[PDB]
Design a protein around this ligand. Sequence first.
Ligand code: CYC
Ligand code: CYC
Ligand code: CYC
Ligand code: CYC
Ligand code: CYC
Ligand code: CYC
Ligand code: CYC
Ligand code: CYC
Ligand code: CYC
Ligand code: CYC
Lengths: 160, 160, 160, 48, 67, 100, 161, 161, 161, 161, 161
Amino acid sequence: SIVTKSIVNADAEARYLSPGELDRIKAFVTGGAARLRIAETLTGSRETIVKQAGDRLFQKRPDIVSPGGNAYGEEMTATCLRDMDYYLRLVTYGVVSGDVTPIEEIGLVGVREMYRSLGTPIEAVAQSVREMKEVASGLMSSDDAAEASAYFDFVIGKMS
Amino acid sequence: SIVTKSIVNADAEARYLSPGELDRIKAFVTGGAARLRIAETLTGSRETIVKQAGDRLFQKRPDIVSPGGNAYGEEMTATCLRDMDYYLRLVTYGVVSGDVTPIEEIGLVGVREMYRSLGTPIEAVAQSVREMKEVASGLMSSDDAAEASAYFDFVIGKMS
Amino acid sequence: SIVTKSIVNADAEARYLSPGELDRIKAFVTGGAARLRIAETLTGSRETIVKQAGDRLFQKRPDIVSPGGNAYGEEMTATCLRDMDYYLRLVTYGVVSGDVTPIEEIGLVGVREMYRSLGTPIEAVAQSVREMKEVASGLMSSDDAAEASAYFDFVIGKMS
Amino acid sequence: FGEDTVPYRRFPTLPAANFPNTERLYNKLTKQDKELVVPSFTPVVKVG
Amino acid sequence: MRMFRITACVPSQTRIRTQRELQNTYFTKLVPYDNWFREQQRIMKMGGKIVKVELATGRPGTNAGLA
Amino acid sequence: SAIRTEPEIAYRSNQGVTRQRQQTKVFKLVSTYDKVAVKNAIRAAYRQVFERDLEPYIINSEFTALESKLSNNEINVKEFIEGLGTSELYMKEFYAPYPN
Amino acid sequence: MQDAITAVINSADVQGKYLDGAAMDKLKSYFASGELRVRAASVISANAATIVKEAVAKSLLYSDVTRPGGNMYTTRRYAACIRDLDYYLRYATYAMLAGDASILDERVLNGLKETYNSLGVPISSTVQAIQAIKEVTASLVGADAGKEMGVYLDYICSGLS
Amino acid sequence: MQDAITAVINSADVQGKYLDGAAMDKLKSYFASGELRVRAASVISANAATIVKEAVAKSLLYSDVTRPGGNMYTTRRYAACIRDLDYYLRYATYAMLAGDASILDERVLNGLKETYNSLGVPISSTVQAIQAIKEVTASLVGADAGKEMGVYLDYICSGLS
Amino acid sequence: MQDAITAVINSADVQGKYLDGAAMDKLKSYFASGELRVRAASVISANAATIVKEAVAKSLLYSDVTRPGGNMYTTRRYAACIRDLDYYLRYATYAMLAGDASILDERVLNGLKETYNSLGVPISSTVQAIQAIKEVTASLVGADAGKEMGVYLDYICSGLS
Amino acid sequence: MQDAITAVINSADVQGKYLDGAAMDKLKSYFASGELRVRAASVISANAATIVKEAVAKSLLYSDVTRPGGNMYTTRRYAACIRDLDYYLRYATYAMLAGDASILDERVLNGLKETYNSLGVPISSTVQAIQAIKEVTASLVGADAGKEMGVYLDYICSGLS
Amino acid sequence: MQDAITAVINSADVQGKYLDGAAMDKLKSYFASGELRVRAASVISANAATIVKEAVAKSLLYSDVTRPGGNMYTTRRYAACIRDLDYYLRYATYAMLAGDASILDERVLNGLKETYNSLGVPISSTVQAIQAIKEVTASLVGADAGKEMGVYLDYICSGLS
Ligand SMILES: *[C@@H](C)[C@H]1/C(=C/c2[nH]c(/C=C3N=C(/C=C4\NC(=O)C(CC)=C4C)C(C)=C\3CCC(=O)O)c(CCC(=O)O)c2C)NC(=O)[C@@H]1C
Ligand SMILES: *[C@@H](C)[C@H]1/C(=C/c2[nH]c(/C=C3N=C(/C=C4\NC(=O)C(CC)=C4C)C(C)=C\3CCC(=O)O)c(CCC(=O)O)c2C)NC(=O)[C@@H]1C
Ligand SMILES: *[C@H](C)[C@H]1/C(=C/c2[nH]c(/C=C3N=C(/C=C4\NC(=O)C(CC)=C4C)C(C)=C\3CCC(=O)O)c(CCC(=O)O)c2C)NC(=O)[C@@H]1C
Ligand SMILES: *[C@H](C)[C@H]1/C(=C/c2[nH]c(/C=C3N=C(/C=C4\NC(=O)C(CC)=C4C)C(C)=C\3CCC(=O)O)c(CCC(=O)O)c2C)NC(=O)[C@@H]1C
Ligand SMILES: *[C@H](C)[C@H]1/C(=C/c2[nH]c(/C=C3N=C(/C=C4\NC(=O)C(CC)=C4C)C(C)=C\3CCC(=O)O)c(CCC(=O)O)c2C)NC(=O)[C@@H]1C
Ligand SMILES: *[C@H](C)[C@H]1/C(=C/c2[nH]c(/C=C3N=C(/C=C4\NC(=O)C(CC)=C4C)C(C)=C\3CCC(=O)O)c(CCC(=O)O)c2C)NC(=O)[C@@H]1C
Ligand SMILES: *[C@H](C)[C@H]1/C(=C/c2[nH]c(/C=C3N=C(/C=C4\NC(=O)C(CC)=C4C)C(C)=C\3CCC(=O)O)c(CCC(=O)O)c2C)NC(=O)[C@@H]1C
Ligand SMILES: *[C@H](C)[C@H]1/C(=C/c2[nH]c(/C=C3N=C(/C=C4\NC(=O)C(CC)=C4C)C(C)=C\3CCC(=O)O)c(CCC(=O)O)c2C)NC(=O)[C@@H]1C
Ligand SMILES: *[C@H](C)[C@H]1/C(=C/c2[nH]c(/C=C3N=C(/C=C4\NC(=O)C(CC)=C4C)C(C)=C\3CCC(=O)O)c(CCC(=O)O)c2C)NC(=O)[C@@H]1C
Ligand SMILES: *[C@H](C)[C@H]1/C(=C/c2[nH]c(/C=C3N=C(/C=C4\NC(=O)C(CC)=C4C)C(C)=C\3CCC(=O)O)c(CCC(=O)O)c2C)NC(=O)[C@@H]1C
């Protein structure tokens, strides 16, 4: 939440919210309608969004399912897709909340540790998230496309 | 070098390189003939060892040489052979020196950053170094095999 | 012990022990046989060492056992011999451990303060340890003489 | 610690109760509990 | 943030430290502006001689935009 | 005196101040030439300041600039410690979730 | 800590689901609160010292609390009380602008009763101080904003007691 | 903290007696086991990450702990659990190399149960993960070194339970 | 901390009155005692080391505590006892010179019980050493200065108990 | 820091090629010198303080440096000289054992000249003390090891100059 | 409470398994020690009053505790010490007979520390009395059988520490 983000930033200096923080809270509370609207528009296409993104990524980097690969097996393909689904839920959470704090607290912090422990390629998972973002931008409205692509972009850059 | 490591430790403790380290330096300098001989052995058989190591690594992880993977192209495979050559030369340096300081100062510090910037599966690189260690152990005789294996699995653990 | 010191250093660095430290532990284990022999020799010659050490010390410094001295009475002389026995036991501990750590941790931290509180001549105690070293070197082999004299000199320097 | 030493856990003798307070602080792992080991020192004499 | 870089020689006036000490006896550090006054007070009270100081980062007399 | 049974022996082996007072290391960045020593000191500083290794608590290391400055010797270990203290992670971990 | 928005987010996430209709209506309610909360926060930031000043002048000021024997005696203890009021007001503003008391009970109630008891603090006098804070804030923020601010301050008082 | 040699020395010191035959025999036993312990420690240092990875995969994946609701959910909690297992492995290796469990007792066990109860993490799941690490380590190191590591790991589990 | 004079000051100021005849009488009594207090403090400072040495000789030496395994074993610990007895004597001198034993329970007894319990210090042995110091200092300084010093040292002992 | 071994390895690595006949020759030459190096280092470690003793006695004692007005006046400055000579002897021993005078550059000469100029240390007297140390060490450890230590001591004195 | 047999049974029952060879071996060891335990228990029961008599005589009599104002003054309090020492001896005999020192924890050490701290009972003096009891009972029942009694009295002393 941008609310809690600015609250923590102000408390760091032990003072009330600045005019900039209060103005951004104004904008977020006003645009919460469009934010929740993009929330439904992305939460309704979850199956198709993940299916298209994973399918595209599979020929983007065939090594993921190639023999001796990270997700060569059917089970590991499904597991990679399930990670795609988790990250899409996290981006939905972040877009609704107006801040990347849910993303950070759920599925970004220590993720490099996660994927070095499991051997999965961080660049490949970033490309998967990019495919998710591309399909979402295609299947949603233009302004909503940019709004959701902001948080898709954040997660892609941070994880990658 | 073992002498350099002992000097660093003695300086850190403000000491005079106690007999517990002086005798170790004496033993190393006396037995240096075997270390040198292992050095020429590895230098002579570097090409073959690298070749079977690459063969075993590709057998275990064919995806890396696949077009999706990093090693595909007949020049990425050449670059893997080149990196294995560097690592073998570094291990020879470490064996002749007596400690892992040249190893870590040449090719272990920031290796994760390098392989992330190159997209390389560092765990696959560790597997390749394991194959190199097994080939070298087969090529050399027992105690020499363990002496080289100390540096080999040190590099393996650091890479992992 | 070298084992405990290496473990402490490795834990402070939050890492596993390096090959150099492991080789040091191997050398320590190998020398454990000779160290045990020296410790057994001292323990067997325990009462002898204290007896001739005390006699020679009193010959060199008769005032300490003279009337008005810290060790005039028979009980006071027995207390000196008790302290000498303490330090010989500590030296045997150090010889077994391969390091001066047990000696310093048991009877070398605040030794100056303790003997100043007791009114004991610290230089006289140093001379006592020197006499003990002479007795042990006399009744011990040449190389083992130097090995134990290292710890004896450590205690003497700590006294001074 | 000076200008070159990384700070390390200390074992001070003084002042009073500083050793027990540091002991209670350092004998517990991170996030072990939310209680306050030393919320404040109850003064023996209250001014006014 | 308008940092300061200073070279100061701080002798030892109470203890004879037996390990290496140039790294804290003659050093050039980068000091933030806010902490520069406190750091200099501490150094002088510790007895060091401030050989040199210069505003490495920032611009002099900036009436605005100094962070 | 007495027999000193095993319970008393074990108890008296750890009697006064814990041995951790001496069984520790102090990281003094004597020289910045030793890059391995600099890295070790930096990691130890992270451990002391944050009580933990900061692998599972960071997206990526934000203290990379401080590490570079320390390795270049333009700031001292005290400055590195101050930078670690004045960090978003420190206020997240020990300042945000606790009273003053 | 958390607010209403993060509460709905993590309530969904713990079950590992997207935002259902209940979460949507909760978020809509919080957004509707919205500008009212931000305006109350802005006015409080305006007259930050004011509410504490007249709250003290109403409840604590000119009494045995500020007299000898009372905990407010001496300028040091007086300024400590003022600092405590400033803490309470900033946390109240934060909790108001967030929508949850997690910030308070993570930054206030943790050990606060025991520390005040160790200092021999008057819990009743403190509670009266927060009350006067509540009325002074209400008189400057309005009816509903003042009501929610008073609710948060009352939670603070309950935790303190 | 104390290895076998230091433990024997401290015990003899507390009795105020020299190193008798029993102490000498114990020290000789440790010296005999030294080469084994060194090789096992080297192997575990080489394969530390792989051991934890395999143990987690074969013990703590695709279950409720990994799923939301389980305490291993999210990258943060999963990394915390992985780091806990890495700590367990490294400290067990330290105890094996030193021939004594005092390091585990003073650096691991103390407050471990308290923190686990505070954070609600599954002690049973942690115990099972330690088990799996035990089998992986035994397989990598051998039989006798495997048992030496396993006794300390089971001691960790017993303390944590 | 509080002395004989600031004790009267705070006693008056809690009710906020001025210094009446009784306060002046108390201050004059303290000023009369000041000569004895200063002389005793100077003598005690001169003979501090010898006093603790004699008390240790007649209360702790040649016993189980000093024997191997005992808490007074391990010369670092003996020096720790020497320093602790020095601290007790010096702060007792502070309290005697002040006329009020508030520094004793502020800068001395604060946390002492838990400190000794954690470290396994023999509390009764420390108390006995304190009465040994009390007797030695009373003999050294006289009957009245010894009276006051014994009062404060026994206050410390009661705090330990 | 680099020894002869590290220098050879760096010379090979800059070209990025495996070790060759010249590298083996250099390594075996250093190995041959290692016996003398270790013996000289051990003897210097055994009697390091004595060497500083005769060096200071025959170089600076009973002179204007030690007299009032000289920088060796006062016990603090005398101990500073003793510790500095210990530094020089220890680092010369380090350089002799390593075979390369790089430890002197990066651990001794790094800012030593500027520090001496700022603090007023007399460089000429320091050089004379260094020469005295070299003479004593040569006479104490023989001819070949004497020259080996002397070359590094002359390196340090030249760097000071 | 618990004994050797109950300890083995609970050790088996915690994992729910039956009794394997190790458990039967431990039970056989306890049965072997049973004759010694019964011998020592009967002897201590016969000579219980005597043992406390000489323990008090050689540990507490003619001392500050017994002197007027001492905690062992006021004959009711002396009888209380006699009864408490008898309690310690009886429950130590219980622990020796059982082979497990859990009856001491759940029937002697339960609240005894708080009891003595609230009552002003010298803990170190009581520990010395228990040590004297240990010496007397060891001399009465021999070194081997006295070893167990010493172990359990030492457990009581450590718990009371
Ligand atoms: C003659 C050899 C020298 C000498 C010795 C001396 N010592 C004492 C008394 C004590 N010595 C100790 C020492 C130790 N306790 C420890 O725990 C350690 C090792 C960890 C040491 C070294 C202690 C504690 C005492 C006093 C308590 C006790 O004895 O139990 C005496 C008698 C002093 C007196 O007046 O009682 C003497 C004579 N004194 C000299 O002058 C010689 C140089
Ligand atoms: C001769 C008159 C009779 C006698 C007396 C006797 N008593 C003791 C020892 C002690 N007497 C006491 C008594 C008390 N302590 C108290 O607090 C009270 C309240 C007034 C009383 C009555 C104590 C505590 C002791 C022992 C401890 C100490 O003395 O400090 C003895 C000595 C016995 C011994 O073994 O020491 C004697 C001789 N004994 C007789 O046979 C006469 C009938
Ligand atoms: C797919 C785009 C990429 C990929 C994925 C992949 N992941 C795994 C296994 C796991 N991934 C996770 C990650 C999470 N679980 C969570 O609950 C969250 C927090 C919200 C995250 C980030 C975990 C925990 C696992 C293992 C346990 C589990 O599945 O719950 C695999 C298989 C690993 C295996 O060896 O079994 C794969 C393949 N792989 C790719 O190559 C893509 C780029
Ligand atoms: C091979 C099995 C694995 C792999 C390796 C790989 N590396 C590169 C490219 C480079 N490697 C380096 C640097 C080093 N390699 C070393 O061994 C060391 C010695 C210390 C160093 C410093 C560099 C700088 C490059 C690129 C530039 C250069 O080659 O000089 C490649 C090619 C990557 C590309 O796209 O060009 C490869 C394939 N990659 C895998 O996937 C395998 C697991
Ligand atoms: C002595 C024969 C000459 C002399 C010396 C002298 N030096 C100082 C003070 C310092 N000397 C150093 C030098 C070093 N410290 C190191 O760690 C090393 C490298 C490992 C070196 C070379 C330093 C740093 C100081 C200052 C800090 C300190 O002492 O810790 C003094 C004292 C100066 C003063 O008053 O502060 C003196 C006297 N002086 C002579 O006249 C001789 C020729
Ligand atoms: C000595 C006769 C008895 C005894 C004491 C003992 N104490 C310690 C260690 C400490 N003592 C203190 C106490 C204080 N510090 C203060 O500032 C105050 C105010 C006066 C007090 C009372 C502390 C804090 C410590 C620990 C810190 C430190 O020692 O620096 C020891 C040694 C502990 C160790 O392990 O070194 C001892 C021996 N023990 C006995 O057996 C005597 C009865
Ligand atoms: C890369 C394009 C070229 C290159 C780079 C290179 N740089 C260094 C070392 C340092 N670089 C810096 C610079 C910075 N540190 C910071 O924190 C920032 C501000 C945010 C900057 C600009 C510093 C301070 C160092 C030294 C300390 C450190 O490690 O950071 C090296 C290594 C030098 C060495 O010998 O260690 C290299 C290789 N090298 C090339 O060849 C490229 C042209
Ligand atoms: C008069 C010289 C100046 C002045 C005074 C003034 N003060 C107040 C109100 C208060 N003053 C205090 C101060 C103290 N109380 C203490 O206990 C202590 C130490 C013993 C101090 C310093 C307090 C607490 C109050 C509040 C009322 C009370 O005491 O209960 C006022 C009135 C403020 C109001 O709003 O009522 C005034 C006017 N004002 C000047 O301009 C003079 C320079
Ligand atoms: C004033 C509103 C009432 C009062 C209280 C009072 N408080 C103190 C001292 C302290 N108060 C706190 C409390 C907090 N600090 C925090 O950071 C937080 C949350 C942000 C809280 C709630 C603390 C820690 C102290 C002590 C440290 C300090 O001075 O900052 C005093 C003085 C006590 C003393 O012994 O001096 C008083 C009197 N008393 C009243 O009568 C008012 C109703
Ligand atoms: C993994 C097998 C299981 C698991 C682990 C888990 N632990 C935590 C948090 C903590 N664990 C510890 C324990 C230690 N830290 C140490 O340094 C040592 C010393 C040897 C121990 C024993 C601590 C102190 C914490 C809290 C601090 C921290 O940042 O880790 C978590 C996260 C809890 C949270 O709320 O963040 C997790 C997930 N969880 C499982 O479900 C596995 C069975």
